[PDB]
Design a binder for this molecule. Sequence first.
Ligand SMILES: [Mg+2]
Ligand SMILES: [Mg+2]
Lengths: 396, 396
Amino acid sequence: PKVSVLITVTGVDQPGVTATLFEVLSRHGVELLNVEQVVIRHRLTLGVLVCCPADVADGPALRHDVEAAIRKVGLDVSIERSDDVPIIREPSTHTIFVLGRPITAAAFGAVAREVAALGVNIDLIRGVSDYPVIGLELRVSVPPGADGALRTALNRVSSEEHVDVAVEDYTLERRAKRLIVFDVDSTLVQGEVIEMLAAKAGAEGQVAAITDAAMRGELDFAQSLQQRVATLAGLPATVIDEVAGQLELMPGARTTLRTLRRLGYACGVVSGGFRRIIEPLAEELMLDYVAANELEIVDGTLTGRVVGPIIDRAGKATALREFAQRAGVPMAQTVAVGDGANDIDMLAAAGLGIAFNAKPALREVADASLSHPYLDTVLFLLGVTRGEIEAADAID
Amino acid sequence: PKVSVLITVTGVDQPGVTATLFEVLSRHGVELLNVEQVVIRHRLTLGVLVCCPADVADGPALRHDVEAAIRKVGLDVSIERSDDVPIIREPSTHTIFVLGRPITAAAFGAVAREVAALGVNIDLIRGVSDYPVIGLELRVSVPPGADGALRTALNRVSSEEHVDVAVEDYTLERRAKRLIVFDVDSTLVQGEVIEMLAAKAGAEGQVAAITDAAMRGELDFAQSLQQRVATLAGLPATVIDEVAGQLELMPGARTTLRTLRRLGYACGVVSGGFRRIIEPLAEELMLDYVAANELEIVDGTLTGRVVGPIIDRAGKATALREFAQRAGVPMAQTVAVGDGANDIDMLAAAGLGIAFNAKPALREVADASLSHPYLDTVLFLLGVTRGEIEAADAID
Ligand SMILES: [Mg+2]
Ligand SMILES: [Mg+2]
């Protein structure tokens, strides 16, 4: 080891190639500086960087020994002086997730096009899921200052080509995500509980109308809440237990929460909804934190008011901050998932803010958006694969 | 998309290949099922699995369009019906770390040999460090029930070929490690504080002798502690502050702790040593938990006793369990790092037990061993790379 040599093996993968190459190398005076190997669709690449004595690199003995052993079995091999060559590759700066059902070639092509345009190198591509959505990951190296430009390009691509596209910082700190919060209505839970309550008063129509306006950001949250809850005035509080029982989880929600617990996540919900409905479900799903509003009840009857203070847009963010503090988790390591303008400050406050089948106003400011009715696609954005999830679930 | 096709591109890497391939594919009716791409030492492999109409896969139009575009620029491409082909690869079951200074080809060759013998498939190899030690990772798929056999083979290889070799479960749960404890003397800190104390009494020699015996497991811990501390009887308690100031961290310790905090680890020390020495240093290093013994002091003078109960071998384990409980971390997600037989139950109790420049008795039962005087090599065993550490440190 005075000078360095690079050995590169390619061809149709076969058993024992790796061991054969190094058993051959061991017969010379060779120390390893770096090894890289993968098989993709039965294509092997094995790159080995060694430093051997000056005496050895000058020698066709090493060359012949390697060339003969590799070519004999049917693969190809190259061998060259390195010296100027980098020993270990630098980490990727970002990772890009592409989800779709389907992901067209045109879509992915548009992603690649935008990436290359900004002088972004693609370091790796792999699949992260084949179900319930096709999911692909590109780890990339982005030129400094170009990432803002990159997110913009890819947002345009996402809207035009019908795929979800998320860009995330791939640094150590930023991917040690430890805490997550979900909005409840239309996020963790299907539908709007307040509409289910309003149905019992025969007011479902107007309340659905206002809820939709409020989640689009057209109405101030607090006022929209007071007005909608007013429509409940008179209902017996028994109605809370009924609606609570009719609640169905978002598809994939159980898988999501279960996988997140496996990963050691602190988990919570932040809702402008009602705690008597949310806390039963939260306890059962074994959550770590709840923040919700509260219905005023007099004589076992709903008054049509909520008990202040009212969790509003700023309030959600404040609750995440609070939760993160109780939990000892920096904001950069928090995740928030919501569907409404109700959620904008919570998503913004989060290290990673995820819009889930969301109104435009939320999508507009979210770190990432998800457009299929499967909450587990959240897991793909947290660096988890379908196979990993299924593997862990198989062991029970 | 009625049937599936596999497109595989190989050759010397060039800019815009990825985008070119998909721009070409977009002109046909093609949806993506899976994409995999890497460049190793300028060798590109791009494997793309698509489902195109039955009408299209029968067509030399797609074939010619792809073959022409790829071959024009100098790369090679194959195209074949798949159908029977798996869409996304399953996760690796284990990962193997190889550290050495140097790592000979013979060493690595022996690792590969043992791996292939047990019918273990190598899914990936990469470098994880080039400094202060050469570090390589092999993600592998191990046949069920063969892992015990694998750890044994590789332990033999490790001892015979002069490299550290660790086998770890590569499951979701088992690599979401969230809590770590260090032994202090000869682990986080250089040397044995008790010998530094004994030097002040002119007893360094005998105390060094007993400490060595005790860390090899030849002497019961509690008795070895009482006897050694007895030799301090009479020293003024001022001696505590002096020795404390002479304490030097193990090389790489600051990097280790700093990186672990970036990763959101709960961090602590469990020592049979003395809290008046350890707690000052622990506070400064901003640790989350300390367990230590305590020197008995009368009239500002050491009595030569310790204040019971005495943290012993079982005691260390008990402290880790306690810490894990305060922290809300399951034992499978805990890490312990020690050098002595003093540490055997703590290492055993830990999800990942790491022996650091350790006596044989500790190495014998450890999940993994490390033989170079660099504490940061712990980070490599936790799935961190040198480049990642340097990257995060560069941003300050
Ligand atoms: Mg909502
Ligand atoms: Mg020790």
